[PDB]
């Protein structure tokens, strides 16, 4: 869990166990070309590599084999109207290599107007032969 005080372990003590997990996770699409067995996540900052291994093993039954993380610096270079820097938040990225010869490809997610569109078909733009004269009149 995150934003929780962990209890201190003394040598010979019990197993540290988390029962309700605080931190979420989201698997993003890779922005570059990556191997077929690598799944890229956005871990939250406090989640270690080992927590991510047991997180996907326990909750999702994913056979995880390697995990490699990079912390991404979001830019502090964009300002308000007040000339005050906005920070896009930093985030950790997990790169997960799945075991047993399995392979993940990111799926193809995302594969009254009658009145408007039925007057956009009855537009009847002005004739050039009419020379600017309004054609409402029956004369």
């Amino acid at each position: 869990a995150r934003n929780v005080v962990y209890p201190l372990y003394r040598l010979g003590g019990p197993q540290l166990r988390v029962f309700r997990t605080n931190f979420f996770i989201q698997l993003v699409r890779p922005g570059v070309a990556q191997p077929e067995d690598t799944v890229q996540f956005r871990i939250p900052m406090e989640m270690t590599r080992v927590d991510l291994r047991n997180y996907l093993e326990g909750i999702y039954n994913v056979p995880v084999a390697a995990v490699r993380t990079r912390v991404q610096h979001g830019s502090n270079k964009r300002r308000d109207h007040r000339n005050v820097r906005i920070k896009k938040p930093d985030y950790k990225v997990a790169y997960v290599q799945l075991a047993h010869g399995q392979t993940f490809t990111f799926p193809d997610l995302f594969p009254l107007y009658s009145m408007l569109e039925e007057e956009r078909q009855q537009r009847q733009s002005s004739d050039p032969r009419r020379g600017g004269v309004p054609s409402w009149f029956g004369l």
């Binding site: 009254l112 009658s114 039925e118 020379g131 004269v133 054609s135 409402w136 009149f137 029956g138 004369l139």
Partner: protein, 211 residues
């Protein structure tokens, strides 16, 4: 741009995510996108019942008299440019189509006596009554300019006008207002214009030719 697809594709290429938000108020329209049944000119007592069950004091034998006064008085509101009466007299599908191109020029329409009696032709039908009327009148026009020089029509001389005017009523406080004006495909061309027109050909970039 030219349509909504161009703006949404440009907003997707740019990154403008416009979330479609849920609002309890919508647009309370009082008109129709065009005509219910296109009366093509040379048994609809169903819709007369479907009008009298809402209105219940409605004589068709008096209505083309009323349709005359809805017509003529609305056209006199062009002689003064009185738009606030036109919104009582004309629908909102009909208001721009008669007042937009006439802006920044003076018109001097006038009515003189009808050749025929005006007579109702058909009647059709949250509920929109729609009554097409045949009028065979004699009218006078003079459309001037910003500069006050005549660009359409002799002012004295009356001309004989056929008018298949479609009226519409909302079916609480509304009334019969001019909705459209059918012009038949057999109709003769209108008055010619006092000026001459050049109509351009294809503007050729150097890589293409005229053929």
């Amino acid at each position: 741009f030219k349509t909504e697809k161009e703006f949404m594709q440009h907003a997707r290429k740019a990154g403008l995510v416009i979330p479609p938000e849920k609002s309890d108020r919508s647009i309370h329209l009082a008109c129709t996108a065009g005509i219910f049944d296109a009366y093509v000119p040379p048994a609809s007592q169903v819709s007369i019942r479907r009008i009298k069950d809402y209105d219940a004091n409605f004589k068709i034998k008096d209505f083309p008299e009323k349709a005359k006064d809805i017509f003529i008085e609305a056209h006199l509101c062009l002689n003064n440019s009185d738009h606030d009466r036109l919104h009582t007299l004309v629908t909102e599908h009909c208001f721009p189509d008669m007042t937009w191109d006439i802006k920044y020029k003076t018109v001097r329409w006038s009515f003189v006596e009808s050749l025929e009696p005006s007579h109702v032709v058909q009647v059709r039908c949250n509920v929109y009554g729609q009554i097409t009327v045949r009028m065979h009148t004699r009218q006078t026009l003079a459309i001037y300019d910003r500069f006050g020089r005549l660009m359409y029509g002799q002012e004295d001389v009356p001309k004989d006008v056929l008018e298949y005017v479609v009226f519409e009523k909302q079916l609480p406080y509304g009334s019969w207002r001019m909705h459209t004006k059918i012009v038949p495909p057999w109709a003769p061309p209108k008055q010619p214009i006092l000026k001459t027109v050049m109509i351009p050909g294809p503007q050729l970039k150097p890589e293409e030719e005229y053929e």
